[PDB]
């Protein structure tokens, strides 16, 4: 069963499900808005092995990124038209991490599912690489796995960027 | 709890889930099938900015589209041979977006998630960008988002092209 | 209502829902890990239309696999480089269909949803088109529709690659 | 988790749920009204033992009977006083069978509860003395079991007498037996 | 599905059940305990004939009542032993009508069953005889049934005489009306 | 939702619900049936005030117990006659109390109703005055309150006597009480 708006509004009251920070202007019919933070994460290795710890570099940024597809090659002149053009702070191709501004935790007997906003869908930018379920007991930012598959984006900080929703759970879990 | 065959049978009969047009032969054990209209949308701004209203155009198909990868990097010629080849009347690269036939109503106590076609995944033919769920209260046909992630593939007008999956929800909705 | 790690286990045990292998240590919260088998396919037609046969080679590895994204151009040179470099022994761009090692069979009253690892995830490797929800009743392992889409990820023979949810029905479906 | 009308409705619409003769206006909020039969069984039996066939009577009435609580000692005389004063058909003392019209058939995910009717209760006849849930798979009429506890009542033929309350099973109930037959 | 403790004390603090009063000790693990008014109505009618405004009498004890088995047969004489004994405001036979303290409003996704209390289940004590089960969108004080059967009971004002049991329907109810305002 | 025949076994497999002694085919399609055990208690005492411990003796029954309707006005001579007639072991007027054979234990999302037989609330016989819902976390047998209210009815040892009924919680409960060992 999904948790509808007046669900959320009492597992949030009750600090069952922990939303921090939380809006009331957030939550939806059936889901709960989460929003963009500003800080990105971009591997630097030459392919992933998993098997390995990965190196990454961290970047912060100010207002806005443009997410351009994979294999859009971009050089130097381009991406500073693009910063010229759009008042971008941060121009990506292929696949960046970011992270939800919003911590959550769950409890023992909800399950949630992140997805990408529709509004965002429809300019094929996604934010999350699977389904997206997140366990009973989690607690955490949520890593939001951003690409885009058309033309380039601008993502800008604080946006909405995507929805969690719900599940209650058929028994509680033991974690 | 996601409803059976014979619960979407139920919501359709008594108008709790508007499926205009219905078909029974489209409704699985616990899905209903939903098909591919004729009418597409294709965006012809160099970046998406949501701030911003987009410019697009609009195809209407007579019986097929070519779906090619991002970075197919089509030619005329190339677009004539395959036209000649595969007898599609308009080919693409890139995100196209595109309509089910079907318009839905969901009632307050319905959210409804929308999956692409198994077999349509199998050819790495995805016609969402998104985990696919629609609001509890929601009116309108459903937005495909579609990509091709391997070869280029072709899509029918009409054919089978996802599947919607409704799901109860704990406690009606205020929408 | 989502089945809780418990509830998984009651179900395995009385042959409810059928997983071949199980390994109790694969279950958590709320879900079952599954895991990649050695067997591939690879489609070798220009393109793909369902309204034929599709052309297909199958590929057995022995231990691992690097999947690169579409467009990555191998060479042959390149791809002894990465087989020296990273001891994988098939080395495949855009997409490939993979197992996983378990069988499932679903009763009547449960639907399992497909979603692939987070870890993979968040290294933009995907193991599922769609949303990934299987029919009440089904029977059969599950294809994985696998695509990398930032740099080549390290995928290895047996290694937990996603997760089945399995969920409630309302009713008892008819299959 | 219980159905409400709407389920109900959609439930009886699709033959899921067997209710016959089926009244639209007596679906509930979340039950459905069931109507007292013009049968009535009382037993003739010094003692209730289960291991034998009882002995009983059966009545018919025309349109109303009183219901007496245990040892309100009736005699001709109390009866035909009764019967003249408040126009009954019959005048009993202590329990009586009585029958829905209605019958049901229950599918293998619900169950449902009798219970009688509350301005029934509210004068302390009651038509069912357990808590009344019915097995899925069930089909037949619904037994009464009306009793009085403080004062005679009367009761007419085909009123509202009480409500069934279906509830989902967690799952589909192996209803004791299958059926295969080409 | 049944609401927990949890359940209850949410639905509660967001209003879309109201228990007033509300005492959030009286939340067990998934029921809610209620408690008995002091206001009582015997009714004086040889037979009950719901076709009728039935005939009581209202009494408001201060502190106690004793609640005899029907045909208790009570005298002025017996009346004032069991005063004198053990200190009751009223003694009285037969069924007895009371009401809870507790004003409840269920919302139309809840139905609710009160159930009288285990222990005084236990020395033969009910405070209802049907099963219980609320209409979704009931507004009200539960009207309670009172009846012993086997020895007289001993019931106090404000005791905790039962609770309720509130349930999740599967889709909300049609309360059976609506009302539009501007 | 109510467990399922299905539900019920996967849950005692897994020690999730305990039920000592188990028998496989007491499991229907939506509850459990529970028996009933040699020893009675029947109460002495003029009144029932809760605030004391009441006096009660215990009895245990070889094999068969005959329950008559309170107020049924047993002299020795009427006890003999039924002993000998029917060989009972005991005769009782009015409220007995009994014990299930079934020693349950319910988790932290389950909570159960009792309910007496329909076969023995076909003759009047109910082994429960309330609803019969147990709280989720419960541990103990079941307390059976037996009451006759037609004609007397012959109980035996070990007879199937009612069911229990399990609901799933919406949530789990605090059952009221943590305990952390080590």
Not at 7 to 29: A, H, L, Q
Not at 39 to 59: A, G, M, Q
Not at 104 to 128: K, M
């Amino acid at each position: 069963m999904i948790l509808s708006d007046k669900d959320i509004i009492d597992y949030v009251t009750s600090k069952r499900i922990i939303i921090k920070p939380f809006n009331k202007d957030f939550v939806g019919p059936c889901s709960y808005d989460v929003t963009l933070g500003d800080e990105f994460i971009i591997y630097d290795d030459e392919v992933y092995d998993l098997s390995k710890e990965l190196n990454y570099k961290r970047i912060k940024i100010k207002n806005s990124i443009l997410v351009c597809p994979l294999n859009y090659n971009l050089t130097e002149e381009k991406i500073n038209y693009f910063k010229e053009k759009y008042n971008v702070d941060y121009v990506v191709e292929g696949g960046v991490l970011g992270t939800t501004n919003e911590y959550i935790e769950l409890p023992n007997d909800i399950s949630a599912q992140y997805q990408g906003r529709s509004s965002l869908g429809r300019v094929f930018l996604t934010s999350h690489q699977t389904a997206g379920w997140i366990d009973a007991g989690f607690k955490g930012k949520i890593t939001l796995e951003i690409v885009a598959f058309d033309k380039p984006v601008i993502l800008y900080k604080n946006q909405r960027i995507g929805q969690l929703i719900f599940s209650k759970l058929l028994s509680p879990a033991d974690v």
